[PDB]
PDB file of C-alpha atoms in Angstrom:
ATOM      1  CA  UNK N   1     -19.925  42.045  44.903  1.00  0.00           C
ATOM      2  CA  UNK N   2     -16.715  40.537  46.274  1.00  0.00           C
ATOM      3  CA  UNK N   3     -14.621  37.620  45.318  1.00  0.00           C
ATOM      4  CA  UNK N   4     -11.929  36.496  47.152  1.00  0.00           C
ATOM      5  CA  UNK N   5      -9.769  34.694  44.764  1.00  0.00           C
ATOM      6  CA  UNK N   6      -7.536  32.160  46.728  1.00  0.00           C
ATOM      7  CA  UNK N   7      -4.133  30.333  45.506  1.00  0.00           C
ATOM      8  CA  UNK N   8      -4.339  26.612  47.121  1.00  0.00           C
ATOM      9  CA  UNK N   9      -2.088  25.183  44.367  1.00  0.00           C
ATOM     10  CA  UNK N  10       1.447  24.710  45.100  1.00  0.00           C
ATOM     11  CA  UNK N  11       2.418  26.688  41.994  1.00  0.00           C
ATOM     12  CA  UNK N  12       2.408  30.417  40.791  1.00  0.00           C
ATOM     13  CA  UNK N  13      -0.666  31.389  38.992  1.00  0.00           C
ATOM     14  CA  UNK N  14      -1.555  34.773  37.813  1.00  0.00           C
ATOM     15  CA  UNK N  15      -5.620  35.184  38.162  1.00  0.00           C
ATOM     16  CA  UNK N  16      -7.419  37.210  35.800  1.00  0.00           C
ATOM     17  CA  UNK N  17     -10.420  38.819  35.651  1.00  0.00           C
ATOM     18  CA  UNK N  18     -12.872  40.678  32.778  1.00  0.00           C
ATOM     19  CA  UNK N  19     -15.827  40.751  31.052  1.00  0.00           C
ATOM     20  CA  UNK N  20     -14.217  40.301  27.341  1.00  0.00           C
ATOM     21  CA  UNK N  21     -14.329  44.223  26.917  1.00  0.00           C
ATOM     22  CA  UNK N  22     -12.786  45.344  30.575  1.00  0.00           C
ATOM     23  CA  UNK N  23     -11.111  44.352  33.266  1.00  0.00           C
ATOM     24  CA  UNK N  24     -12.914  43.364  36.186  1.00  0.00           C
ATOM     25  CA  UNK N  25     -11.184  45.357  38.984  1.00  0.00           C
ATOM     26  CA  UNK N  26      -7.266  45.494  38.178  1.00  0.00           C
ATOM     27  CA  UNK N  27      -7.841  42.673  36.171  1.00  0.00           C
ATOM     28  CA  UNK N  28      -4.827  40.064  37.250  1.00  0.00           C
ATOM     29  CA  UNK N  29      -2.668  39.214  40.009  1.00  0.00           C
ATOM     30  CA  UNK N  30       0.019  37.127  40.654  1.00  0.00           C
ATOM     31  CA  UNK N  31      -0.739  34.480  43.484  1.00  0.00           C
ATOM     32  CA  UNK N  32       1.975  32.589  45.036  1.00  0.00           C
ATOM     33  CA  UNK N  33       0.657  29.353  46.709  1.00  0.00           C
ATOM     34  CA  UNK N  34      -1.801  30.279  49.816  1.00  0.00           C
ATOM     35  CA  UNK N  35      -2.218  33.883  48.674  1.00  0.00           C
ATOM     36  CA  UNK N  36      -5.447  35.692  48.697  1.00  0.00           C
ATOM     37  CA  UNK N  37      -6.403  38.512  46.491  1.00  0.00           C
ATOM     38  CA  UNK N  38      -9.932  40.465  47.006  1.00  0.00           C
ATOM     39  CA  UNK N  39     -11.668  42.022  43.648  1.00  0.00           C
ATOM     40  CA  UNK N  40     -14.885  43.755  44.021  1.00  0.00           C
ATOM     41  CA  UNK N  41     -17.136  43.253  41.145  1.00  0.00           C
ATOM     42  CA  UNK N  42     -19.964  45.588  39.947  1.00  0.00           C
ATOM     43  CA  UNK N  43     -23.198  44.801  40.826  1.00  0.00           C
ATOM     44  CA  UNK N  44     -25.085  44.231  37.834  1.00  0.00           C
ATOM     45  CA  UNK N  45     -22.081  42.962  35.788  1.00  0.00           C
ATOM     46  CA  UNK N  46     -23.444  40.493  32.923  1.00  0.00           C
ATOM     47  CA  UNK N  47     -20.687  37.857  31.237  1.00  0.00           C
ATOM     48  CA  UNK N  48     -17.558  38.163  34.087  1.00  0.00           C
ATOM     49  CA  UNK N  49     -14.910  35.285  33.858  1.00  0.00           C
ATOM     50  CA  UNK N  50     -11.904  34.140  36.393  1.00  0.00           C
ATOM     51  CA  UNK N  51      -9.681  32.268  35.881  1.00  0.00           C
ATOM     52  CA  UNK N  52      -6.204  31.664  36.024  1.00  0.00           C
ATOM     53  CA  UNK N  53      -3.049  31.468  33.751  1.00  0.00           C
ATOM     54  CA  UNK N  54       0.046  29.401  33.943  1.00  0.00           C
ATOM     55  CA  UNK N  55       3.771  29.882  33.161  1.00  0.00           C
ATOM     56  CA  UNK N  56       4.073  33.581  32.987  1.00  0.00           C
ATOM     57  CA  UNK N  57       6.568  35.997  32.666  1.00  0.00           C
ATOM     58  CA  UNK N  58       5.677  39.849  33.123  1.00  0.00           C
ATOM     59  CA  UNK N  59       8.048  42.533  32.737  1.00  0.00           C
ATOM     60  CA  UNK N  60       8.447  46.300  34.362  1.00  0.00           C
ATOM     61  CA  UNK N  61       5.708  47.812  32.515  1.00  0.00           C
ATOM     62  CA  UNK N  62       2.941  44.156  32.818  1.00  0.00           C
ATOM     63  CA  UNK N  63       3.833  42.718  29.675  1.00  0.00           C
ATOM     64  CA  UNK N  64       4.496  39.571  28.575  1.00  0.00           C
ATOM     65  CA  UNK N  65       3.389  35.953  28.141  1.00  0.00           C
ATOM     66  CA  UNK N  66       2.005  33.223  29.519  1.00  0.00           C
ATOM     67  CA  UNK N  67       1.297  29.752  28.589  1.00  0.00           C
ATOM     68  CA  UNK N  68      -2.258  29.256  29.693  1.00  0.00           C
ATOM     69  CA  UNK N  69      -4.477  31.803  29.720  1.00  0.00           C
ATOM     70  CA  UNK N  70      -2.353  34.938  27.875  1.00  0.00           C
ATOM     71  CA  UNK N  71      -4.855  37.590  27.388  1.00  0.00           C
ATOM     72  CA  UNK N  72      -2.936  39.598  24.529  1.00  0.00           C
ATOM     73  CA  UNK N  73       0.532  40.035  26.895  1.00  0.00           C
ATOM     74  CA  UNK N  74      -1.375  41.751  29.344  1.00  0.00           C
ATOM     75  CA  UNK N  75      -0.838  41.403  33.082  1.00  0.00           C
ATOM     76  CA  UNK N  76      -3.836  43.293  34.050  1.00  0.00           C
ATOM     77  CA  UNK N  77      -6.468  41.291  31.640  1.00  0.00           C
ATOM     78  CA  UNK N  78      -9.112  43.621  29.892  1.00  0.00           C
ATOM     79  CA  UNK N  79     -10.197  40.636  27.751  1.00  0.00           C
ATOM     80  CA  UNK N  80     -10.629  36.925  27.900  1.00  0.00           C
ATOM     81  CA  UNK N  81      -7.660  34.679  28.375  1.00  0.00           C
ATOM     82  CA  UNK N  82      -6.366  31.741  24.823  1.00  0.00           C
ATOM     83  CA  UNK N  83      -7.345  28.552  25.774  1.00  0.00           C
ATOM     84  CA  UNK N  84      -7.134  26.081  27.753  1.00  0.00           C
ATOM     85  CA  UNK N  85      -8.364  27.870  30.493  1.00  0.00           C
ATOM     86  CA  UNK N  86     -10.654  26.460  33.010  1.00  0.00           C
ATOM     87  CA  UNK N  87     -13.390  29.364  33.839  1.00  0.00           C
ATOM     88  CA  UNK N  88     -15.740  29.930  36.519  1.00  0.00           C
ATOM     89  CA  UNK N  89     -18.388  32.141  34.769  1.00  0.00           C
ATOM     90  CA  UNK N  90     -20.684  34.634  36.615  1.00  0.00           C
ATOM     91  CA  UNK N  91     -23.611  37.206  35.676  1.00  0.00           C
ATOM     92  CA  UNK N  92     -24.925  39.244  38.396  1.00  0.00           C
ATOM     93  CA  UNK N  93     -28.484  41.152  39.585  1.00  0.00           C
ATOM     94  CA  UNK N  94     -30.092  39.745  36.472  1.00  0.00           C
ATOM     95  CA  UNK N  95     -33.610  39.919  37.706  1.00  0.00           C
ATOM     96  CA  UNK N  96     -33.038  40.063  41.421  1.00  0.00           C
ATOM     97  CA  UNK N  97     -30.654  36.615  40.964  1.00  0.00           C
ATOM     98  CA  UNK N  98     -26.986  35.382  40.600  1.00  0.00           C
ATOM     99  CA  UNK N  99     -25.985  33.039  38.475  1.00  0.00           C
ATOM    100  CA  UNK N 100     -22.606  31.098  38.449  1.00  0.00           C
ATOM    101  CA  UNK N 101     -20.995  28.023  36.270  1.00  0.00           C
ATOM    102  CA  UNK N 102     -17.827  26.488  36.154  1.00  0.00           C
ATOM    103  CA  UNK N 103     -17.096  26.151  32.309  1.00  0.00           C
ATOM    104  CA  UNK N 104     -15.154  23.527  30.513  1.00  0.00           C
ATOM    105  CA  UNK N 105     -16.158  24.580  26.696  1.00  0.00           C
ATOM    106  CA  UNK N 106     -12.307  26.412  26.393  1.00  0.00           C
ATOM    107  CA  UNK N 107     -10.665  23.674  27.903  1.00  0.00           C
ATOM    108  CA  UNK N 108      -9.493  23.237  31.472  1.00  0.00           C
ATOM    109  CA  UNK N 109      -5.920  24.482  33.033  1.00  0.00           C
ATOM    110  CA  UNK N 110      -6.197  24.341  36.504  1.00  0.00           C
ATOM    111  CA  UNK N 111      -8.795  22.796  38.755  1.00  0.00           C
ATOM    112  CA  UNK N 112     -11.208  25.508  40.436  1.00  0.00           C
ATOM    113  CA  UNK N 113     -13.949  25.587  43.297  1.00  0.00           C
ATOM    114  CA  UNK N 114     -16.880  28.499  42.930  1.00  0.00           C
ATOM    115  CA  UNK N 115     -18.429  28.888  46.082  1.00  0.00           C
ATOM    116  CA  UNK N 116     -20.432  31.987  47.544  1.00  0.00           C
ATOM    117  CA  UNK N 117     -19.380  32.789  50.890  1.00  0.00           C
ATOM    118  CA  UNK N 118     -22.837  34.183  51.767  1.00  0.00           C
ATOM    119  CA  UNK N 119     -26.129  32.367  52.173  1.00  0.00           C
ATOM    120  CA  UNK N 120     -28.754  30.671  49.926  1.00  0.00           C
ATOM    121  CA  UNK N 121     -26.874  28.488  47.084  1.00  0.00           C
ATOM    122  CA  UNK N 122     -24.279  25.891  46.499  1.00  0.00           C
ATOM    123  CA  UNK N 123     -21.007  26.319  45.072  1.00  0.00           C
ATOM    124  CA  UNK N 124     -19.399  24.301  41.979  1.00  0.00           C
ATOM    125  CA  UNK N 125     -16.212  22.400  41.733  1.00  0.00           C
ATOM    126  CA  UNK N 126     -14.185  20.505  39.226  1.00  0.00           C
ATOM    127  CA  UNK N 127     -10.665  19.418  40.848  1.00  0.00           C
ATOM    128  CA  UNK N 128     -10.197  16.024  38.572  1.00  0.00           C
ATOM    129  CA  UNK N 129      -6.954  15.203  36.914  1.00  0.00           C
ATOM    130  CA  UNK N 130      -8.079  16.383  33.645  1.00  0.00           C
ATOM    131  CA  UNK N 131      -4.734  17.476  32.381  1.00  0.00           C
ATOM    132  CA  UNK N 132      -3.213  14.118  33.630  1.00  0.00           C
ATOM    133  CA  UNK N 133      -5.920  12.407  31.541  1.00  0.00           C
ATOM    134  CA  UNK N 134      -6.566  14.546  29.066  1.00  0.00           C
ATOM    135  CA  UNK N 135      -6.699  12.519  25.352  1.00  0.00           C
ATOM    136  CA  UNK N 136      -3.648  12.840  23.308  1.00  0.00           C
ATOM    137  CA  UNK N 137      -5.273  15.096  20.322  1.00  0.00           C
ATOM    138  CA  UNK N 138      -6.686  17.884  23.036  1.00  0.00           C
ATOM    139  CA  UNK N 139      -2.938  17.907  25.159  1.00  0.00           C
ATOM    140  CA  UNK N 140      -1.798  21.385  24.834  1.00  0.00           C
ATOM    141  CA  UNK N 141       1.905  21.467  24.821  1.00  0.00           C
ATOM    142  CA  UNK N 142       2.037  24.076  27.121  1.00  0.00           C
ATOM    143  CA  UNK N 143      -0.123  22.755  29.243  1.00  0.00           C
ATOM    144  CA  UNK N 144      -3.678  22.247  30.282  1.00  0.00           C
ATOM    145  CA  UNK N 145      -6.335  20.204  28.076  1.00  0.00           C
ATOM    146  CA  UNK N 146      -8.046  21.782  25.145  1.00  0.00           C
ATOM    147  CA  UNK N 147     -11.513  21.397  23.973  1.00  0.00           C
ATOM    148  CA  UNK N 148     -12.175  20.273  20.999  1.00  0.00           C
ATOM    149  CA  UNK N 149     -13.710  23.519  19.224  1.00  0.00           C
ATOM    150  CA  UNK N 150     -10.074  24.703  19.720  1.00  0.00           C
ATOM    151  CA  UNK N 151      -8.141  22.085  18.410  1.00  0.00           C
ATOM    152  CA  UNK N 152     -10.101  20.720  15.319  1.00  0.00           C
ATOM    153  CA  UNK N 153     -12.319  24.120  14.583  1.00  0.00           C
ATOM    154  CA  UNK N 154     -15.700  21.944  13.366  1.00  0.00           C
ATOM    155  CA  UNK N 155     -19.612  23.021  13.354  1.00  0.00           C
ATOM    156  CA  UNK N 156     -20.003  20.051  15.315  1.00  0.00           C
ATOM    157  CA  UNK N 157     -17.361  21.137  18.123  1.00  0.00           C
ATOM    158  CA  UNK N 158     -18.007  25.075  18.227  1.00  0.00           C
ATOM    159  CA  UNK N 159     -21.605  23.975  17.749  1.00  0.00           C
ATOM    160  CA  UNK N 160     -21.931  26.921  15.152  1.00  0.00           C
ATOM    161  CA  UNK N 161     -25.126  26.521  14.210  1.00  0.00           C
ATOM    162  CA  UNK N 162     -26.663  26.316  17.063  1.00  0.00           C
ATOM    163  CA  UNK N 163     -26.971  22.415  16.685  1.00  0.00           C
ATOM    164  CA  UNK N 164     -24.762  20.812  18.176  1.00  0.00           C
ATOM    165  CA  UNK N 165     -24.651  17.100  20.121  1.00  0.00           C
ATOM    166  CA  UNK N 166     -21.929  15.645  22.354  1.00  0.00           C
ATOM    167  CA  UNK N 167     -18.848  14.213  21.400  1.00  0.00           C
ATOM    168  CA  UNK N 168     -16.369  11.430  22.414  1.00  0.00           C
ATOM    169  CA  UNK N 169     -14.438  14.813  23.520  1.00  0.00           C
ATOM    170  CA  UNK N 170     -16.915  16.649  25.573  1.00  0.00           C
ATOM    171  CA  UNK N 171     -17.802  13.335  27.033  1.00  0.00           C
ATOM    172  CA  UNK N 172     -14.197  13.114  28.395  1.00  0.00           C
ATOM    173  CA  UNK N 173     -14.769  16.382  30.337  1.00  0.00           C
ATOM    174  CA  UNK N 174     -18.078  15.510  31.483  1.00  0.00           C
ATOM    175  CA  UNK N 175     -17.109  12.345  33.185  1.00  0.00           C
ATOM    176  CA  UNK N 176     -14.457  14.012  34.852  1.00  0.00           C
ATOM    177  CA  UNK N 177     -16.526  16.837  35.805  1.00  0.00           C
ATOM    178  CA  UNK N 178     -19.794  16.310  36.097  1.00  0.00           C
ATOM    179  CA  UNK N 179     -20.971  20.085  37.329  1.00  0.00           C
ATOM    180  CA  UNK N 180     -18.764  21.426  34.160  1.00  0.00           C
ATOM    181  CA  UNK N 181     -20.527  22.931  31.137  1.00  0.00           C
ATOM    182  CA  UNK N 182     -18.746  20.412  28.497  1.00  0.00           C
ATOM    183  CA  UNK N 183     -19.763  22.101  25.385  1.00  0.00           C
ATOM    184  CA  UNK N 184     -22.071  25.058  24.218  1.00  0.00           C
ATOM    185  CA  UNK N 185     -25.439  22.899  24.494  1.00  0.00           C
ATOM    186  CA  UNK N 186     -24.570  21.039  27.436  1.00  0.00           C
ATOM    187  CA  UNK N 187     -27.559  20.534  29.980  1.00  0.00           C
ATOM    188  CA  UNK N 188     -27.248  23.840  32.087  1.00  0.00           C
ATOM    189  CA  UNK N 189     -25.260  23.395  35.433  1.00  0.00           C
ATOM    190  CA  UNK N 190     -25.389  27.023  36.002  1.00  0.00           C
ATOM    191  CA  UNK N 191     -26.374  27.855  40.534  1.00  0.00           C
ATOM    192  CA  UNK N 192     -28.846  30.059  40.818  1.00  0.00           C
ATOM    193  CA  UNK N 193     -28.102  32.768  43.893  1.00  0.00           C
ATOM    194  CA  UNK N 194     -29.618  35.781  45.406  1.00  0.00           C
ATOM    195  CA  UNK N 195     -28.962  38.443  43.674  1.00  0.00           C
ATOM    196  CA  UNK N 196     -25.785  40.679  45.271  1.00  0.00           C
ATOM    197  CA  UNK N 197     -24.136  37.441  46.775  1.00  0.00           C
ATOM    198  CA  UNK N 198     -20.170  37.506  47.727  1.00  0.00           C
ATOM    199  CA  UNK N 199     -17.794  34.177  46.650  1.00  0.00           C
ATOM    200  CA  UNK N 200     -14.693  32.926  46.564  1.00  0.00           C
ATOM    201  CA  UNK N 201     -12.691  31.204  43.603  1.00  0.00           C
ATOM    202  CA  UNK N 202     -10.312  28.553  45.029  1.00  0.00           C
ATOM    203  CA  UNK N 203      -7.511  27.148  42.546  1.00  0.00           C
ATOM    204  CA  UNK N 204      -6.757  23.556  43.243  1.00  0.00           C
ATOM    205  CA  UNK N 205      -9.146  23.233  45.966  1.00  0.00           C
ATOM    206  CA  UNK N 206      -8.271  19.672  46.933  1.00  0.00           C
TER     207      UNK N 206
END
């Protein structure tokens, strides 16, 4: 599969992508504002994330730090990025279907459109002002918003036991981005596509 992952913010950002034991592809990228880079993903691939991190700084050899998003000093990502980090969530040819989310449960960085850029599903966005908005307790001080699992580390936030409910904190997210996943047992807002589909990740979209 392709994904075309596009800068539209007017800031750096350095996209990453894995599956929590690999890199997808190279893994990360840094994308001025308007660039475009192309990944292709293999079919089949269950549990990839993209996203993007903030604030970075990289030497010779890819190593470094950033302040959204670091996943372990690496440039080229072979696992998942420290919160906050908005993610747009994909498992592919499960069954003869796609099947994408935008997820909220590790807090939100940047805002991010998922869209496939062939036919036969829609795509997701959430491009509020979260950070701008975000409730003082969550405020990363690096930036972004965290979820609450992150900050306070509770059964009820992590939903640990597999019982969980919403919170005044997911609640935040959720009316600020409806088509989100807020927390782990949020009502599913996962697109179903055909299976072997192509899409494009846009960073602030609007």
């Amino acid at each position: 599969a392709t994904f075309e992952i596009v800068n539209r913010c007017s800031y750096t950002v350095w996209a990453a992508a894995s599956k929590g034991d690999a890199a997808l592809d190279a893994g990360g990228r840094q994308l001025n504002s308007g660039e475009s880079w192309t990944i292709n993903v293999e079919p089949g691939t269950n549990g990839g994330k993209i996203w993007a991190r903030t604030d970075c700084y990289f030497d010779d050899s890819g190593s470094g730090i950033c302040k959204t998003g670091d996943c372990g000093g690496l440039l080229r990502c072979k696992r998942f990025g420290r919160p906050p980090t908005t993610l747009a969530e994909f498992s592919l040819n499960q069954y003869g279907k796609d099947y994408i989310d935008i997820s909220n449960i590790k807090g939100f960085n940047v805002p991010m459109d998922f869209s496939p850029t062939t036919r036969g599903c829609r795509g997701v966005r959430c491009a509020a002002d979260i950070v701008g908005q975000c409730p003082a307790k969550l405020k990363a001080p690096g930036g972004g918003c965290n979820d609450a699992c992150t900050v306070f580390q509770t059964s009820e936030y992590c939903c640990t036991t597999g019982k969980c409910g919403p919170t005044e904190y997911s609640r935040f997210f959720k009316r600020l981005c409806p088509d989100a996943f807020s927390y782990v047992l949020d009502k599913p807002t996962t697109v179903t596509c055909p299976g072997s589909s192509n899409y494009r990740v846009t960073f602030c979209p609007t």
